[PDB]
Write a structure and sequence with these properties.
The protein has 311 residues and is mainly β. The chain is 0% helix and 40% strand. Bound molecules: ipratropium (3 copies) and choline ion (6 copies).
C-alpha cells in the first residue's frame, strides 16, 4: 500500500523514491510486491528474507527507524522486474543455487539451466515439510546445512532424498519435540512398510516413520534396533531376557531346536525359559543357557530323551 513515489534507475540499481526517500524492505506498490533490502536496492530472483506482513519490515523508508524484530526467514522468488511471485501452489522455476540468490536488480548472473518444481505456502513463501502428490508423500527440507559455526539455507524447500529426520522447526530445531526418521527414495517418494536399505530391513509402517524396538506386524513380533531401526535376527538378549528371532525376523514361541539343542520360548512373551517349567502337563528343565536337559539326571531327577521328567 505504498503510493506517491516512483521507481528510479541509478548506479546500475533500481530504487523506489517517494518524497526524496528510498523505500527499504517490503512494499506493496500498485498491485505488486517488492523488497528493497536495507538500503533500497530492489531485489530480483531467489531471496531468503524475513517474512512480510507484520509491519516491522513493511512500508518502510530509509528515513524511518528500523525497530528491532525477530522474524523467521523464508525463501521467496521475485521476477526480473522485482515483482514477488505470489504463488500458493507450485511452479517450475530455475533451481536456486549459490550463484543466483540474493541478487539485486542491475546485477548480472546466470540462470539455472536446471529447473525444478517448487511448492509454496499460502503466504507465497517456499513450502517446507510434508506434501502429498499423486498418491505419494514427499518431504521438502525444513532445514539447511549446518557446518560448525556455519549455516547454508539453500537446501530449504528442496525435495529430500534418503534417510531424513523430521524435526519440529521454526527459527531453530525444537529439541524437546520428537523427530522420527523417514526414508525417501530416488525420486523423493516416502517409503512405507518393510524395506531393505543398505542390506538391512527397516519397518516404516503406514505413516512412514521408522519403527524402533519391538513391533507387532501382521500377527508376528519383530525387533528393530532401539536406536538405528535395523531388524535383528537370531538370538537376542533384550531386557535381561533371551529371545530367538528367525531369519525372517519373526519372534519364535514354543519349542525351538538349534542344532541338537532344544530351547523353550515363552508362549506369549517369547522369552527363553530357564530352570524347571511345565508344558501341557509335562515337566522340563532348562540349564542357565536355556538348553533343555535330556537323557540325564537333574538334582536327583530323571528326564528322558524328550527332556520329560521320568516318573
Ligand atoms: C522491474 C520492476 C522493478 N519495475 C521497474 C517494472 C515492473 C515493476 C517496476 C516498475 C514498473 O512496473 C510498474 O510500475 C507496475 C507494472 O504493473 C507495477 C509496479 C509495482 C507493482 C506492481 C506493478 C516496471
Ligand atoms: C537411525 C537411522 C535412521 N540411521 C540414521 C542410522 C541407520 C540408518 C540411518 C542412517 C545411518 O545408517 C547408515 O547406514 C548411514 C551410513 O552412512 C547412511 C546415512 C545416510 C544414507 C545412507 C546411509 C544411521
Ligand atoms: C517332580 C518335579 C515336577 N518337581 C515337582 C520337582 C522337581 C521339579 C518340579 C518342582 C520342584 O523342583 C524345583 O526345582 C522347584 C524349585 O522351586 C520348582 C517348582 C516350580 C517350578 C519350577 C521349579 C520339585
Ligand atoms: C513431486 N515431484 C516434484 C517431487 C517429483 C516429480 O514426481
Ligand atoms: C508422512 N506424514 C505426512 C504422513 C506423517 C508425518 O506426520
Ligand atoms: C521382515 N520381512 C521382510 C523380512 C520378512 C517377512 O516374512
Ligand atoms: C515380544 N514381547 C516382549 C514384546 C511382547 C509379547 O507380548
Ligand atoms: C543365546 N544362548 C544363551 C541363548 C543360547 C545358545 O546360543
Ligand atoms: C523337546 N521336545 C521333545 C520335547 C518337544 C518338541 O517336540
Amino acid at each position: 500500500n505504498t503510493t506517491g513515489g516512483r521507481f528510479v534507475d541509478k548506479d546500475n540499481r533500481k530504487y523506489y523514491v517517494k518524497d526524496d526517500h528510498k523505500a527499504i524492505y517490503w512494499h506493496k506498490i500498485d498491485g505488486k510486491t517488492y523488497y528493497f533490502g536495507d538500503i533500497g536496492e530492489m531485489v530480483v530472483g531467489w531471496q531468503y528474507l524475513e517474512i512480510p506482513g507484520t509491519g516491522y519490515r513493511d512500508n518502510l523508508f530509509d528515513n524511518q527507524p528500523v525497530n528491532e524484530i525477530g522474524l523467521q526467514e523464508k525463501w521467496y522468488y521475485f521476477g526480473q522486474d522485482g515483482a514477488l511471485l505470489e504463488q500458493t501452489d507450485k511452479q517450475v522455476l530455475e533451481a536456486k543455487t549459490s550463484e543466483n540468490t540474493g541478487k539485486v536488480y542491475g546485477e548480472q548472473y546466470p540462470l539455472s539451466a536446471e529447473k525444478r518444481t517448487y511448492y509454496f505456502d499460502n503466504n507465497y513463501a517456499v513450502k517446507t515439510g510434508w506434501i502429498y502428490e499423486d498418491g505419494n508423500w514427499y518431504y521438502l527440507n525444513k532445514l539447511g546445512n549446518f557446518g560448525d559455526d556455519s549455516y547454508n539455507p539453500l537446501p530449504i524447500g528442496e525435495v529430500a532424498k534418503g534417510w531424513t529426520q523430521d524435526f519440529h522447526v521454526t527459527i531453530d530445531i525444537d529439541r524437546s519435540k520428537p523427530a522420527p526418521w523417514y526414508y525417501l527414495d530416488a525420486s523423493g517418494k516416502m517409503l512405507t512398510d518393510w524395506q531393505k536399505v543398505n542390506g538391512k530391513w527397516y519397518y516404516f509402517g503406514s505413516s512412514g516413520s521408522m519403527a524402533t524396538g519391538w513391533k507387532y506386524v501382521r500377527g508376528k513380533w519383530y525387533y528393530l534396533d532401539n536406536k538405528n531401526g535395523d531388524m535383528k535376527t537370531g538370538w537376542q538378549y533384550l531386557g535381561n531376557k533371551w529371545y530367538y528371532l528367525r531369519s525372517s525376523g519373526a519372534m519364535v514361541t514354543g519349542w525351538y531346536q538349534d542344532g541338537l539343542t532344544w530351547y523353550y520360548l515363552n508362549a506369549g512373551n517369547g522369552d527363553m525359559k530357564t530352570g524347571w517349567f511345565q508344558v501341557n502337563g509335562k515337566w522340563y528343565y532348562a540349564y542357565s543357557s536355556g538348553a533343555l536337559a535330556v537323557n540325564t539326571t537333574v538334582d536327583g531327577y530323571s528326564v528322558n530323551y524328550n527332556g520329560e521328567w521320568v516318573q
